[PDB]
Amino acid sequence: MKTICLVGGKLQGFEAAYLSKKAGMKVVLVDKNPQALIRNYADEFYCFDVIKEPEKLLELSKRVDAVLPVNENLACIEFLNSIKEKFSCPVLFDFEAYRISRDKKKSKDYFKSIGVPTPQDRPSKPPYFVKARIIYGLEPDTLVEEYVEGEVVSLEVVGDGSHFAVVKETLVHIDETYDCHMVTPLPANPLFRQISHDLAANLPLKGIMDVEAIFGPKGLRVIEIDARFPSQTPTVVYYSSGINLIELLFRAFTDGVEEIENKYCIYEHLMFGENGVLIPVGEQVLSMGSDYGKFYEEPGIEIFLCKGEYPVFTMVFWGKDREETGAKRCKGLSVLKERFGAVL
Ligand SMILES: Nc1ncnc2c1ncn2[C@@H]1O[C@H](COP(=O)(O)OP(=O)(O)OP(=O)(O)O)[C@@H](O)[C@H]1O
Ligand SMILES: Nc1ncnc2c1ncn2[C@@H]1O[C@H](COP(=O)(O)OP(=O)(O)O)[C@@H](O)[C@H]1O
Ligand SMILES: NCCC[C@@H](N)C(=O)NCCCC[C@H](N)C(=O)O
Ligand SMILES: [Mg+2]
Ligand SMILES: [Mg+2]
């Protein structure tokens, strides 16, 4: 049995914990927040700030198989970079790739440098997209791009520095706030796969990255990369393709990775609002919760409950095809109806 240490216990931390458990690993969580969202989901919880007390994390490294940063606190990531040679196990992160991916303008310069199409900068006609809002005087540093209509599509890539494993396409379902409330799998797209390969190869990526593109009216446009363990999509990747991104990332830092199921999966967040009206919500709502863990499971159905000001449910449905998965979704909703008096 292997043991993984997660630095960060919110949304990324949940995803990494969830897949670590699927792989049969013990999950050790480090988080500075004593009320960290997934404190009760992890197998062990150590409450400290890694920047203030590095020796405690270094000591943990002696007794786990890997340390995975799962936060986007720049102070934390940059400090971890500065002490990474002192660790007694792999640190499953690409610090140079993160320095590029975190900065949207630097990412766009990177895309252009390798000929990857991306939305036009500072356009002259509306609509504009600004970063998240559509516009029909902001800080001098705001990204202004053309608004590209169409499907938002995600691909994860795991690299070992030499080989780049492009995994599974997913559809990012967006709400009125441009947050993601649902994820479903998509058929292979040879163009998007090659672009994602090249984005990883040219870094060169040793670690994990996701690539998001919009399938626009004038073709595919890459909108961002994020070189950190994602939320939401890895669960859909797991059921639809059989690949566990935690296992693949761990392999990239041990024996290496090789290039290249066909099930369906529906993943979504639902809030139980005023007098049990069921409302779709984005990730951002879930991150304001106080406690997050497993609520229910049967064949083809997992439900997680995120407690707080109005309970939020994360629903995971799978099956051999769209039809069987739709059937499980209906069953999962009725589990909420008969139990709680929920409407949808
Ligand atoms: N130096 C650190 N040591 C330990 N845990 C940390 C550190 N920095 C961040 N974290 C934890 O990682 C989790 C995710 O942090 P992140 O900054 O990515 O998300 P956030 O939504 O901006 O959270 P916050 O409310 O802290 O701003 C949080 O639970 C946070 O407490
Ligand atoms: N240029 C664009 N044109 C149209 N929609 C966009 C554009 N950029 C972003 N979006 C929309 O805004 C959402 C969030 O943008 P994203 O670049 O993915 O930010 P983040 O780094 O915050 O996740 C996207 O999922 C997409 O729905
Ligand atoms: N592959 C497409 C994924 C986009 C979105 N699902 C995401 O990963 N968001 C991560 C937000 C995490 C915020 C914060 N660092 C936290 O961990 O809570
Ligand atoms: Mg994005
Ligand atoms: Mg992003």
UniProtKB/Swiss-Prot annotation:
Name the UniProt record assigns to this protein: 3-methyl-D-ornithine--L-lysine ligase
Top-rank EC class of the record's enzyme: ligase
GO MF annotations, alphabetized: ATP binding; ligase activity; metal ion binding
UniProt keywords, alphabetically: Amino-acid biosynthesis, ATP-binding, Ligase, Magnesium, Metal-binding, Nucleotide-binding
Binding note for cofactor: Binds 2 magnesium ions per subunit.
Listed cofactors: Mg(2+)
Family statement drawn from the similarity comment of this UniProt entry: Belongs to the PylC family.
Gene that encodes the chain: pylC
Any one cellular-component term (Gene Ontology): cytosol
Phylogenetic lineage: Archaea, Methanobacteriati, Methanobacteriota, Stenosarchaea group, Methanomicrobia
Chain sites annotated for binding Mg(2+) 1: E212, E224
Highest taxon of the lineage: Archaea
Residues engaged in binding ATP: K10, D31, D49, V50, E72, N73
Domain text: Contains two adenine nucleotides bound at the active site. One ATP molecule is involved in catalysis, the second adenine nucleotide functions as a selective anchor for the C- and N-terminus of the Lys substrate and is responsible for protein stability.
Residues reported to bind L-lysine: L11, Q12, E72, S231, E283
Ligand binding (D-ornithine): S154, L155, E156, D210, R228, F229, P230, S231, Q232, T233, E283
Coiled coil: none
Positions contributing to ADP binding: K104, K131, E145, E146, Y147, V148, E224
